[PDB]
Amino acid sequence: MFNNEPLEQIDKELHDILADEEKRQRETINLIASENLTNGAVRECLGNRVSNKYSEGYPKKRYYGGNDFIDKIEELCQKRALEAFNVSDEEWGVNVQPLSGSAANVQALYALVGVKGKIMGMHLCSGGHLTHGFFDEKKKVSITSDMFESKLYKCNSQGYVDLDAVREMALSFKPKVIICGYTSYPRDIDYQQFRQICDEVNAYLFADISHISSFVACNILNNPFLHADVVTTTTHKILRGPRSALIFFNKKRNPGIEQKINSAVFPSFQGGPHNNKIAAVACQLKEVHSPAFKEYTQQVLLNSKALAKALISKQIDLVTNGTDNHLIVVDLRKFSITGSKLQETCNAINVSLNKNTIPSDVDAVSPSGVRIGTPAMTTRGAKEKDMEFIADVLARAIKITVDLQEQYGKKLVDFKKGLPGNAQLQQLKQEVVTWAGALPFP
C-alpha cells in the first residue's frame, strides 16, 4: 500500500532543486576545507534499505533479533576502521554509531569526565571546534561548555599552538581531559607534548582528527594513536565518506574505557543506529586502506603546498605563513577587507570558501580571514599546476572586493548592493564555471 513512482514524478518540486544543487556543485570551485565529494558506491549505501532496521545496542548484544546481517556490517565497519588507522584491535577499540562529529565529541567527552567534568580545548577563534568547550562571556554557546566546565587555550600571535600556555592552564585548572586536533589549524600537532602535559595532571588526551584523518591514516602526518587515550574523527571530510563519526578508545592504556564509551553513545545519548551510514562508512574505509587513496591524500598535500606558495607569490599573507596539511588560512588585513566581504564576493563567482578568524581578531563577529582547503578540488582531479589559477582567481576576487568596498562603502549592507551585475564578477564567474564545469565529478 505504497507509492513507487520515481522522485522526478512523485516530487517534481524537490527534484528540480536537487538537480540545480547538483549543477551548482559541478560548476563551483569548492575550497571548503571540510567538504568533499562522495562516489556513487557510498551513495548507494546511504540509500540502501538497511536503514529500515532498528538495531539498538551492539553486535551480538542487540536488543532485538533479525540483526544478523546488520551485525556483520557493523563488525566489518569496526574492523576496517582499526585497520585503516593502523591500530591493533587488541589495543584499540572503535564505536561506529555516532551520527556526526559533534555528537561523537560530546559522547566521548561524557564517557571520560561526565556532567560537571573539567575539560580543556583550543578556543574557536584560535582554530578549535565548538564541541571543544566553546563559550562566550554572553553565553555558553556549546553544550560542551555547559554540561562540562571548560577552559580554553589560545594560539600565539603567529597562529601556532603555544604549549607553554597549555601547561600553565592545565596545572592551575587541572582538567580530566585536554583536547587537541582542530577545525581550522593549518599545522601539525605535537601529540607527544600534549601527552606529556596530560600525564603531569593525570588528564586524558583527546585528539579530534576530523580535518586531517587521511593524513594520520596514510602516515603523512603525526600519529596521535601513539599517545592519545581517545581519537575522534568525522568520516565526511578529507576521509571522503558519508556524514558520520568514529570514536576510537585506547583499551590498553585505560581498561574499562570500552564500556564507558559504548554506553555514552548508547543508551546515554543516542537510540537506534543509522545502518545506511554504517554501511557507507564501511564502503569508504575499504578505499581508505587501498594504495590509490594514499595517492589522493598525497595529492591533497601537494596541492595545498602549491596553493600556499602561489598565494605567497602574489603577496598574500597566510596564518602561520604556510601549511603542513590540506588547509590554509588567509590573513586579509593588509587589504583592509573582512572575511565576510570576500566570502560574499567569492559566492558571486562560484567559489565556496568560509570566513575565518585570525589571532589578532578579538571577536568572531568580524573575522579577518578566510579558510580554504584542497580535498574537494583534489577529488575533482586538480594538480599542482591548477593551483596557480585558483590562487589567481582568489587574488582577482580580493581586488574586486577592494574595488567594491571603495565604491559602495565598508558597511556590509552597502557592499552587497555592489555585487549583483558587476561586469568583473560575471566574467570571473564565467571562467570559474567553464573550468569547474568540465572537471571530473563523481
Ligand X SMILES: Cc1ncc(COP(=O)(O)O)c(CNCC(=O)O)c1O
| One-letter amino acid for residue 53 of the chain | K
Q: Which helix (H) or strand (E) holds 320?
A: none
Q: Is 183 in the site for ligand 8AO (CB under 6 A)?
A: yes
Smallest distance, a second copy to C-beta of residue 67, A:
9
378 binds, among ligand 8AO, ligand X, a second copy, none (CB under 5 to 8 A by kind): a second copy
The neighbour count for residue 356, using CB atoms within 10 Å, is 27
For 43-79, b/e burial (b = at least 16 CB within 10 A) is eebbeeebbebebebbbeebeeeebeebeebbebbbe
d(CA 122, CA 160): 11
- The contact mask relative to ligand X for 2-41 (x = CB under 6 A, - = no) is -------------------------------xx-------
Nearer to a second copy, 65 or 421 (CB): 65
Q: Is 272 in the site for ligand X (CB under 6 A)?
A: yes
Residue carrying C-alpha cell 603555544: 162
Residues marked active site are found at: 54, 56, 208, 234, 237, 243
- The contact mask relative to ligand 8AO for 189-228 (x = CB under 6 A, - = no) is ----------------------------------------
Q: Is 121 in the site for ligand 8AO (CB under 6 A)?
A: no
**# residues contacting a second copy (CB under 8 A):** 103
d(CA 399, CA 433): 19
Q: Is 245 in the site for ligand 8AO (CB under 6 A)?
A: no
- Can you tell me which of 356, 378, 379, 422 binds ligand 8AO, judged by CB under 6 A? 356
Hey, what's the cell of 331? Answer: 590573513
- Can you tell me which of 39, 48, 51, 100 binds ligand X, judged by CB under 6 A? 100
Hey, what's the cell of 32? Answer: 571548503
Question: What is the distance of C-alpha 230 from the center of its chain?
Answer: 17
364 binds, among ligand 8AO, a second copy, ligand X, none (CB under 5 to 8 A by kind): ligand 8AO
Q: Work out the burial of residue 237: count CB atoms within 10 Å of its CB; fewer than 13 is exposed, 13-18 middle, 19 or more buried.
A: buried
Site for ligand 8AO in 61-80 (CB under 6 A): 63
Closest CA to 433 of 3, 28, 1, 114: 28
Q: Is 50 in the site for a second copy (CB under 8 A)?
A: yes
Nearer to a second copy, 347 or 424 (CB): 347
Q: Is 226 in the site for a second copy (CB under 8 A)?
A: no
Q: Is 379 in the site for a second copy (CB under 8 A)?
A: yes
- Please give the sequence-ordered ranges of beta strands (E in DSSP) within 241-368, or none if there are none: 245-250, 317-318, 327-331, 351-352, 354-356
Residues that bind ligand X in the complex, under the rule CB under 6 A: 33-34, 54, 100-102, 105, 129, 131, 182-183, 208, 210-211, 234, 270-272
